[PDB]
């Protein structure tokens, strides 16, 4: 959705940050300049739209331009967000990480077993004109001891792939019990 | 496949690059430092004689005397595939003193 923005100049990080803002550096193919936004609404809004969806940041320079983030670079010590980078919107064969929602209640589950998800945001491609929001996929007939993955996922028509694709998406695993302390021996 | 810088042996301190293939001899005098050559003479691309053995011989010498009007002294034989078969051009009579 919509967020603020401001053109950045030759100012240094800490200032913008420790004040109550956060700097960025947008680009797209033929672009690479520097920008920034405000903190509180950044933090808040990133919970919702995020890299899950598309951002439409408003520049006071006029153009309320829609882009996408990516690269965010934490401070790693007493940490939190500390420098988002921005790719800009196009229509070319672009790639990103689509969020997911695995739905249902299968057979490994219920008995006590537990799913091991290996991906929620996934490596795929599309044209930004498309809006393949967040893919909600299959978890009906699952069983412990087996795995599902690869090119076995649903496609909102058009969306091509970008992996190998035998990348393991998930697998159901046998839980942990204090009878593994019988192994403690 | 005769890398080995056999040319390092030829990177001694003077060169002379040539070649032999199908029906043609490719003989040329090269000075280096930048890789600036100098002299030329071929087998059939010269409308010389029509026999590889004989031609070879004198073609060397041909170029040699030409080089004598251009001013040289000593160099080194440059080639990758050879076994060395004299080819009594052997660019030796061919000015160089060769061998």
């Amino acid at each position: 959705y919509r967020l603020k923005a401001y053109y950045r100049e030759g100012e240094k990080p800490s200032a913008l940050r420790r004040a109550g803002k956060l700097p960025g550096v947008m680009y797209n193919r033929h672009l690479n300049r520097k920008v920034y936004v405000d903190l509180v609404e950044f933090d808040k809004v990133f919970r919702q739209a995020s890299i899950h969806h598309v951002i439409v940041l408003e520049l006071p320079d006029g153009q309320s331009l829609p882009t996408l983030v990516r690269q965010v670079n934490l401070d790693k010590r007493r940490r939190r967000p500390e420098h988002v980078d921005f790719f800009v919107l196009s229509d070319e064969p672009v790639e990103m990480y689509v969020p997911l929602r695995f739905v249902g209640t299968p057979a490994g589950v219920r008995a006590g077993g537990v799913l091991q998800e290996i991906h929620r945001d996934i490596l795929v491609k599309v044209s930004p004109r498309n809006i393949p929001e967040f893919i909600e996929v299959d978890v009906s007939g699952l069983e412990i001891g087996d795995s599902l993955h690869a090119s076995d996922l649903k496609l909102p028509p058009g969306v091509e792939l970008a992996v190998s694709p035998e990348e393991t998406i998930a697998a159901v695993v046998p839980p942990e019990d204090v009878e593994k302390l019988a192994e403690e021996a | 496949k005769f890398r080995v810088r056999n040319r390092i042996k030829r990177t001694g301190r003077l060169r002379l690059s040539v070649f032999r293939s199908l029906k043609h001899i490719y003989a040329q005098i090269i000075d280096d430092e930048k890789g600036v050559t100098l002299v030329s003479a071929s087998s059939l691309a010269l409308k010389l004689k029509g026999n590889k053995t004989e031609v070879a011989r004198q073609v060397g010498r041909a170029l040699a005397e030409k080089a004598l009007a251009l001013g040289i002294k000593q160099v080194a034989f440059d080639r990758g595939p050879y076994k060395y078969h004299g080819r009594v051009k052997a660019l030796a009579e061919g000015a160089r003193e060769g061998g």
Binding site: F46, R47, S50, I51, R70, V72, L74, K76, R77, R78, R79, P81, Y97, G112, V114, L115, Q116, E117, R120, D121, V173, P174, P175, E176, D177, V178, K180, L181 | -
Partner: protein, 141 residues
């Protein structure tokens, strides 16, 4: 009680630890996360004591996953022998963990299971720590 296996050499020097962690601060594996937080060593006793608290209270639950690995030669010396000769031997197989270094993640439980487990677990460690969820550590390889 796991470790490597007498690799290359067996005695290695002490250490002073300012702060960097080298990284390794996110989910990627499962879900709910326990995050270590001080400049110190992770004790094997506390490794499987955390594992205790876990499968202890939460039994027949779900699956828990690891990113860490305790391996350090605690150069210990014999007692009353008067100081000098030699370095010492590889006891206290601790690991090297600084502030902000996360480490433990649970999956397949209720929110509160994680919560309580992480409470008592934190009550055990030779220091203390924090805990959180899943939303803003997406993208970290």
């Amino acid at each position: 009680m796991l470790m490597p296996r007498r690799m290359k050499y067996r005695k290695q020097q002490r250490g002073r630890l300012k702060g960097a962690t080298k990284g390794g601060d996110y989910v990627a594996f499962g879900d709910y996360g326990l995050v270590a937080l001080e400049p110190a060593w992770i004790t094997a006793q506390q490794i499987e004591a955390a594992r205790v608290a876990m499968v202890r209270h939460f039994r027949r639950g779900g699956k828990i996953f690891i990113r860490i690995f305790p391996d350090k030669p605690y150069t210990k010396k014999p007692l009353e022998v008067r100081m000098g000769k030699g370095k010492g031997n590889v006891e206290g197989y601790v690991a090297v963990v600084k502030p902000g270094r996360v480490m433990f993640e649970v999956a397949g439980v209720t929110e509160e299971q994680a919560m309580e487990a992480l409470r008592i677990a934190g009550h055990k460690l030779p220091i203390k720590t924090k805990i959180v969820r899943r939303d803003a550590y997406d993208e970290a390889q």
